[PDB]
Write a protein that binds this DNA or RNA. Structure first.
Ligand SMILES: [K+]
Ligand SMILES: [K+]
Ligand SMILES: [K+]
Ligand SMILES: [K+]
Ligand SMILES: [K+]
Ligand SMILES: [K+]
Ligand SMILES: [K+]
Ligand SMILES: [K+]
Ligand SMILES: [K+]
Ligand SMILES: [K+]
Ligand SMILES: [Mg+2]
Ligand SMILES: [Mg+2]
Ligand SMILES: [Mg+2]
Ligand SMILES: [Mg+2]
Ligand SMILES: [Mg+2]
Ligand SMILES: [Mg+2]
Ligand SMILES: [Mg+2]
Ligand SMILES: [Mg+2]
Ligand SMILES: [Mg+2]
Ligand SMILES: [Mg+2]
Ligand SMILES: [Mg+2]
Ligand SMILES: [Mg+2]
Ligand SMILES: [Mg+2]
Ligand SMILES: [Mg+2]
Ligand SMILES: [Mg+2]
Ligand SMILES: [Mg+2]
Ligand SMILES: [Mg+2]
Ligand SMILES: [Mg+2]
Ligand SMILES: [Mg+2]
Ligand SMILES: [Mg+2]
Ligand SMILES: [Mg+2]
Ligand SMILES: [Mg+2]
Ligand SMILES: [Mg+2]
Ligand SMILES: [Mg+2]
Ligand SMILES: [Mg+2]
Ligand SMILES: [Mg+2]
Ligand SMILES: [Mg+2]
Ligand SMILES: [Mg+2]
Ligand SMILES: [Mg+2]
Ligand SMILES: [Mg+2]
Ligand SMILES: [Mg+2]
Ligand SMILES: [Mg+2]
Ligand SMILES: [Mg+2]
Ligand SMILES: [Mg+2]
Ligand SMILES: [Mg+2]
Ligand SMILES: [Mg+2]
Lengths: 63, 106, 386, 174
RNA sequence: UAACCGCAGCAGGUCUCCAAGGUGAACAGCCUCUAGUUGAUAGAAUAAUGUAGAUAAGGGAAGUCGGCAAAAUAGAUCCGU
RNA sequence: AUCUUGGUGGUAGUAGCAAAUAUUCAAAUGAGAACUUUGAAGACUGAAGUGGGGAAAGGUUCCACGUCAACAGCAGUUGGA
RNA sequence: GCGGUUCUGACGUGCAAAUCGAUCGUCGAAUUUGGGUAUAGGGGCGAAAGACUAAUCGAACCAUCUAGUAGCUGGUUCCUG
RNA sequence: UUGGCGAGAGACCGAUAGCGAACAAGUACAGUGAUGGAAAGAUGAAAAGAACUUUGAAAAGAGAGUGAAAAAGUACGUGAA
């Protein structure tokens, strides 16, 4: 597959950068079928696509 | 040649002596493949992604001096590959890599 | 026009071409002139360079400011186990030079020597000298006739010897084989001597003695392809030089319209045959001796091996020769020691040498202790000892 | 159809060819000469070993300023190489020729490469940009290859004087 | 540093807005978060000669047309000019 | 005729394809994967950015589906083709 | 930001028909710059170098007069008698 | 009467010739612009342009076939150096 589009749409729908979308590598066939933003929206709901956490920059040492 | 698993220490320090910094962790990968071929005789060596993480833990020039590895010679079950056997290399979660001999695993 | 200021040329045209020697074992190209009054004896010997170390002795040189004072001197240790004799060659004089008439071999050769006749020992059927050995069957008249040939015709006789490389710490199992010339006695006495030493060993103490000047023949350490600045010692060109500065600026005049053989060029450096003369022997060591590193002044029971082993070499468990200064070749290299071609009667050559002290600290760093006991005394008890 | 000059029996021969192959002509010519005349099975094993860097193709004609190698020694040369793209194309053609021979019902055990020939195909042209606003060619040098595998198979005038001599000779011998 | 111009998918050129944390005088240099990228023929080896980057005993411009290049100096506070 | 146009050599499988820190492991796809996609890791731009928008200029390069003969100075299943 | 001193450094069949690196000049005005607009070839414009006027300047580019003239250079094609 | 329209001709040229242009030629393409400005004709009587088989992932090969000829296969008359 080529999920390059799915990663672009997922970023747009979840409202985060492409660097924070996670596409389940075990669900490539199902993800390949998600041509629309609706389809992507369902995949985000059932955890096939997830928003990765922000990398921490602690202000602990600064404080 | 049989199916076998053994635990080994590789001395990466002696094998990366003098290597360019930007090539230390990449060379460590190739050195582990060469070492599996020495010990298991199999041209096909697969490194678990978790081993790859272990080698790269401290960046491209921070390879650990000694690594403990479990090397499993396994039967290749894929159509009709050139080699009937391959090695699989995976890390051994241990405190210190020092002081260990080669041992067999059941 | 004439060169503006004179200088000597760089390097010596007598050591051309600077090429890789043809073998790793340097050839003895001249043996001592034979005095046939004296008893029969080897004129040379084979060894392996172990390493260097340091000596103290008192200087006996009247008129020197250092007369009867201690000097420290670098030395070179050559590991010299006994050589086995395995054959004779008879040479005959001709108007085209010496020619080998015949060789005779010993009945039994060790695998150390047999290995020298193969490039792939492990795969071989090991047939070397198998038919030849059967010449010794019956009385072995076949051998007796070939010896009689040598006695009849030969003008010079050389024995084939081999090293016992098994006795060294070296990884190599294949011995080095070499012809050494017999001086002393008649041709018949020489070929008898050789016959009565087939399969027997010859010890370095038979050949050399304390204080004798000897010559070291060895292939020099290799350094691969080298530029003109280090290979010939030419002057580095100024920092402003475009297209590089470790060069010779002018490689010739317009005429001759050819680069001349006498100009410095880049190429092989090292691995050349060399014959260094007048190395005084300061010690003929015995292998059996547990105190072969000790002296009359330093009575500390110890061997010559320095703490840690000779770096890149090992122990020294055999007879050895200790020679003042340095010789060609690197540690582990086969070396031929040769008796002096002339009779030196310098006061330097005639000096009887007596060592006060031989250094035996580790050469793998800035060694502070001569022996394990010396270390343990000074340090005291450590945590690993408990 | 129409191959180069051949001297084998066409009934005991099979043939294969490839045209306009984008593979160095100079490399394939050397590869082709490396197997010319060889028993077909031997040529296949050897070409497999060349891909594994175990044996080399000797480079006899188109070899100026290449490198030296010990794998040249089996063929008496210092200059040899392992041209993988050439080797692959030539193995495709040996595979095709073997198949073609099987279809005619020749005996595969006795097949040898009786003809192999590489010719220059028409160049393919790109351009390279050089200093000072200049343009130069940057051309491919493709190949035509063709091969043929084949089954192995195993008055006197005398003067009157000479006549007279021969007669006299036999009159004495008797 | 591939949508424009430069013969091209060219280290060149081409107007402007928004602008996080630390260190620090600072939109300096160095490290990080959001966002973006991970492109640029590769593998093996580590000779000479290079290019770019370094260090050097004792001497200290003797080098050279010429201290060219490099080094030394360097912030802040007080003093003293 | 340093002739005109066209074609072709030797040079030569040679010079070379070395600026912009950097890649690695696995799976998937596929005849084929150093280079595609996903995941894991390691790094970089470091907000006077390799981020987000525009003006001039370009003109469909945008997006999808199919898809590799040519082009992307290696490759190619990928692409501003 | 604008400039372009030195290395007479890289490169010098280049990344490039003027670039790259370091070093350096200037950095709140006689400052830098976008767009609009004016000036056109014996003409313009010039804090002046004969500089600049689309890689063209001690007189641009395009076409024509023009196959311009050449006491000068080069070439000038089959055989034998 | 070197234009326009309609005719007839030639000891003229025969695809590097003859108009620049025998052809989707004042075209493609270059240039900011005025302007500049190419290359490129011929399978066979007829597409009868290779069904079908086989090897190959495929391009293609090998067969088979069409044709008077594929020593005519669209990379097409002849086919020099
Ligand atoms: K001169
Ligand atoms: K070469
Ligand atoms: K243009
Ligand atoms: K000076
Ligand atoms: K005027
Ligand atoms: K212009
Ligand atoms: K004019
Ligand atoms: K004149
Ligand atoms: K024309
Ligand atoms: K024809
Ligand atoms: Mg080193
Ligand atoms: Mg003189
Ligand atoms: Mg020296
Ligand atoms: Mg210069
Ligand atoms: Mg030492
Ligand atoms: Mg040559
Ligand atoms: Mg170029
Ligand atoms: Mg240009
Ligand atoms: Mg462009
Ligand atoms: Mg650019
Ligand atoms: Mg602060
Ligand atoms: Mg780079
Ligand atoms: Mg100094
Ligand atoms: Mg000093
Ligand atoms: Mg001083
Ligand atoms: Mg001076
Ligand atoms: Mg001077
Ligand atoms: Mg300076
Ligand atoms: Mg090259
Ligand atoms: Mg370069
Ligand atoms: Mg890459
Ligand atoms: Mg940085
Ligand atoms: Mg960073
Ligand atoms: Mg797109
Ligand atoms: Mg390419
Ligand atoms: Mg390709
Ligand atoms: Mg500059
Ligand atoms: Mg310069
Ligand atoms: Mg150059
Ligand atoms: Mg003037
Ligand atoms: Mg004329
Ligand atoms: Mg004219
Ligand atoms: Mg025409
Ligand atoms: Mg015909
Ligand atoms: Mg034709
Ligand atoms: Mg010809």
């Amino acid at each position: 597959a080529n999920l390059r589009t799915q990663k672009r749409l997922a970023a747009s729908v979840v409202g985060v950068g492409k660097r924070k979308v996670w596409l389940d590598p075990n669900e490539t066939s199902e993800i390949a079928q998600a041509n629309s933003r609706n389809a992507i929206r369902k995949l985000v709901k059932n955890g096939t696509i997830v928003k990765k956490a922000v990398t921490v920059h602690s202000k602990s040492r600064t404080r | 040649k049989d199916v076998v698993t053994r635990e080994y220490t590789i001395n990466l320090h002696k094998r990366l002596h003098g290597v360019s910094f930007k090539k230390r962790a990449p060379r460590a990968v190739k050195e582990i493949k060469k070492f599996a071929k020495l010990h298991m005789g199999t041209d096909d060596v697969r490194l678990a992604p978790e081993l790859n993480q272990a080698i790269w833990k401290r960046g491209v020039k921070g390879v650990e001096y000694r690594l403990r590895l479990r090397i499993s010679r396994k039967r290749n079950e894929e159509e009709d590959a050139k080699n009937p056997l391959f090695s699989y290399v995976e890390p051994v979660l241990v405190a210190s890599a020092k002081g260990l001999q080669t041992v067999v695993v059941e | 026009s004439h060169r503006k200021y004179e200088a000597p040329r760089h390097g010596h045209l007598g050591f051309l071409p600077r090429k890789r020697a043809a073998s790793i074992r340097a050839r003895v190209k001249a043996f001592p002139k034979d005095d046939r009054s004296k008893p029969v004896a080897l004129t040379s010997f084979l060894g392996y360079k172990a390493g260097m170390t340091t000596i103290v002795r008192d200087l006996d040189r009247p008129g020197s400011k250092f007369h009867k004072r201690e000097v420290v001197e670098a030395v070179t240790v050559v590991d010299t186990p006994p050589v086995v004799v395995v054959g004779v060659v008879g040479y005959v004089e001709t108007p085209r030079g010496l020619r080998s008439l015949t060789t005779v071999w010993a009945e039994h050769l060790s695998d150390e020597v047999k290995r020298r006749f193969y490039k792939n020992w492990y795969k071989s059927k090991k047939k070397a000298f198998t038919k030849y050995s059967a010449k010794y069957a019956q009385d072995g008249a076949g051998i007796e006739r070939e010896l009689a040939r040598i006695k009849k015709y030969a003008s010079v006789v050389r024995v084939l010897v081999h090293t016992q490389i098994r006795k060294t710490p070296l990884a190599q199992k294949k011995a080095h084989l070499a012809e050494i010339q017999l001086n002393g006695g008649s041709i018949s006495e020489k070929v008898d001597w050789a016959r009565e030493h087939f399969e027997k060993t010859v010890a370095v103490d038979s050949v050399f003695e304390q204080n004798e000047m000897i010559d070291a023949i060895a292939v020099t350490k290799g350094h691969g392809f080298e530029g003109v600045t280090h290979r010939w010692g030419t002057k580095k060109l100024p920092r402003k030089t475009h297209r590089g500065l470790r060069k010779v600026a002018c490689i010739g005049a317009w005429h001759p319209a050819h680069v001349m053989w006498s100009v410095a060029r880049a190429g092989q450096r090292g691995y050349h045959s060399r014959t260094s003369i007048n190395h005084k022997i300061y010690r003929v060591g015995k292998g059996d001796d547990e105190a072969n590193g000790a002296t009359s002044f330093d009575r500390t029971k110890k061997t010559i091996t320095p703490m840690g082993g000779f770096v890149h070499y090992g122990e020294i468990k055999n007879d050895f020769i200790m020679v003042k200064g340095c010789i060609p070749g690197n540690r582990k290299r086969i070396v031929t020691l040769r008796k002096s071609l002339y009779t030196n009667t310098s006061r330097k050559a005639l000096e009887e040498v007596s060592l006060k002290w031989i250094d035996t600290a580790s050469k793998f760093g800035k060694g502070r202790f001569q022996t394990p006991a010396e270390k343990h005394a000074f340090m005291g008890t450590l945590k690993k000892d408990l | 159809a129409r191959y180069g000059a051949t001297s084998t029996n066409p009934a005991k021969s099979a043939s294969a060819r490839g045209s306009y192959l984008r593979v160095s002509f100079k490399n394939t010519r050397e590869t082709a000469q490396a197997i010319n005349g060889w028993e077909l099975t031997k040529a296949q094993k050897y070409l497999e070993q060349v891909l594994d860097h175990q044996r080399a193709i000797p480079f006899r004609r188109f070899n100026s300023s290449i490198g030296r190698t010990a794998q040249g020694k089996e063929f008496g040369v210092t200059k040899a190489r392992w041209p993988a793209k050439s080797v692959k194309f030539v193995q495709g053609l040996l595979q095709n020729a073997a198949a073609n021979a099987e279809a005619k019902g020749l005996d595969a055990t006795k097949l040898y490469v009786s003809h192999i020939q590489v010719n220059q195909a028409p160049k393919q042209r790109r351009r390279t940009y050089r200093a000072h606003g200049r343009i130069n060619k940057y051309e491919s040098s493709p190949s035509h290859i063709e091969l043929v595998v084949t089954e192995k198979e195993e008055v006197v005038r005398l003067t009157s004087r000479q006549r007279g001599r021969i007669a006299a000779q036999k009159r004495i011998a008797a």
